[PDB]
Ligand SMILES: Nc1nc2c(ncn2[C@@H]2O[C@H](COP(=O)(O)OP(=O)(O)OP(=O)(O)O)[C@@H](O)[C@H]2O)c(=O)[nH]1
C-alpha cells in the first residue's frame with residue numbers, strides 16, 4: 001500500500017533523480033548503502049536485512065549521465081537494471097527518440113516498470129520526470145507515455161516537465177522538440193507541471209542569493225517540490241492530500257491539466273534567522289508573481305485553482321487566516337466558476353534540512369500547484385519560434401531522415417493552437 | 429540370541445535411522461482454545477507524529 005513509481009527520462013531526468021531520490025533517502029533515514037541504522041513505502045522497499053531499494057527507472061539513450069550514478073556511491077543503492085541505458089543518444093531529435101532508437105530500449109523500460117508495479121499493493125501515481133527540450137526526453141519519453149496509457153489505463157500519470165525557457169535555450173532545435181511533444185503531455189498525461197530553468201535561476205539569485213548557480217542547485221528546489229507533493233502520502237498531518245485529490249480539486253475540464261509550481265520558504269542561513277518564516281509570510285511569498293517556477297506572470301491570468309501544501313509546525317487556524325488575506329487582494333484574481341479554490345494540506349513533518357547544499361533550517365514550508373489561464377503564454381512564446389523556423393523548413397531534414405513525415409509538424413502546431421484556444425475560452 | 433532369557437522380548441530393539449529428517453514440523457499460529465498467538469506486531473502505515 002501507498003507506493004509511487006518515479007520514471008526519469010532524458011539527461012535532466014537522471015540528474016533530477018539524483019536529487020529527488022537523495023531527499024527521499026534522508027527523509028526516511030536510509031544510509032547511502034540502502035540500510036536504515038513504514039513511511040518509506042512510497043519510495044523504497046524492504047529486501048530482507050534492512051535493504052531499501054528505490055522505486056525508479058533511470059532511462060537514457062546516452063550512457064554517460066547514467067554511468068556517473070553507476071560508478072559513484074549509489075550503484076549499491078539502486079538495483080543495477082533499474083538504470084536502463086542505451087548506445088547512441090537521440091541527439092536533440094524528437095524523431096530519433098520516438099520512432100527510431102527509442103523503440104529498442106522501450107522494451108526494457110516497460111518490463112522493469114511492470115516488475116516495479118507487481119510488488120505494489122495499491123499504487124497511487126507515476127511521477128514521470130523529463131525535459132522537453134531535446135532528444136530522449138522529448139522522444140522516448142513521449143513513447144513511454146503511449147505505452148503507459150494503454151497498459152495502465154486507470155493509473156494517474158503525473159509529469160514534471162522542464163519546458164523551454166524564453167531567452168535561455170542551450171539548444172537551437174529546441175522549439176521543434178517542444179511543440180512536437182505536446183500531445184504526450186496533453187492527451188496521455190493527467191497532471192502537467194510546467195517548470196523552466198530561468199525561474200529557478202531567479203529564485204536562486206534573489207532568495208538563496210547564490211549569484212552563480214549550477215544545474216545541481218536547480219535540482220535542489222525541484223526536489224523540495226516533490227517532497228511537499230508526496231508529504232501526505234508518507235507522514236501524518238491535519239489535512240492529507242493524495243495524488244487522486246491533486247487531480248480532482250485542482251484540475252478543471254480534462255484538457256486543462258497544466259499546473260505551475262511555487263515553493264516559497266526559499267531562504268538561506270544569512271537571512272533565515274532574522275525573519276519570522278510563519279504561515280502568513282511564507283504564503284505571501286508563495287503567491288508573489290515573481291516566485292513562480294515558470295517565468296509566467298500570473299498577473300495577466302486567472303487562478304482557476306490552487307493547492308497550498310503547508311509542511312511543518314503549521315496550525316490550521318493560521319492556514320485559514322492566510323487564505324483570507326490572499327483572497328482580499330485585487331492583484332490576485334480568480335475565474336468566476338470558482339467560489340472555493342484552495343485545497344489546503346498540512347504535513348506535520350518539518351522541512352528536511354540541507355547540510356552543505358543551499359537552503360537553511362526552516363520550521364515550516366509551503367508549495368503551490370496552481371492551475372491558471374496565465375499558462376497560455378508559455379506556449380505562445382514557443383509558437384513564434386516554431387513558425388519562424390518552419391517557415392523556411394529549417395532543420396526538418398534531420399527529422400524526416402529517420403521516418404518522421406513532414407505532416408506531423410503542422411498538426412503538432414495545430415494541436416497547440418487548439419490548446420491555446422481552449423485556454424482563453426475558459427476565462428470568459 | 430537377541431531375545432530375553434525368559435520373556436522372549438527383543439532386548440537389542442535397534443534404532444533404524446530416520447530416512448528423512450522429519451523436521452521443520454508444525455505448531456501453527458493457533459494456540460489451544462482456537463484464537464491467535466502473540467507474535468510481535470507491526471504498524472504498516474504513515475509515520476505517527
Ligand atoms: N533542471 C535541470 N535541467 C537540465 C539539467 N541538465 C540539462 N537540463 C536541461 O535540459 C534541456 C535539454 O535537454 P538535455 O539536457 O539535452 O537532455 P535530453 O532530454 O536527454 O536530450 P538529449 O541528451 O539530446 O537526448 C536544456 O535546456 C537544459 O536546460 C539538469 O541537471 N537539471
Ligand SMILES: [Mg+2]
Pocket residue numbers: 010011060061062089090091134135136137
Ligand atoms: Mg539525452
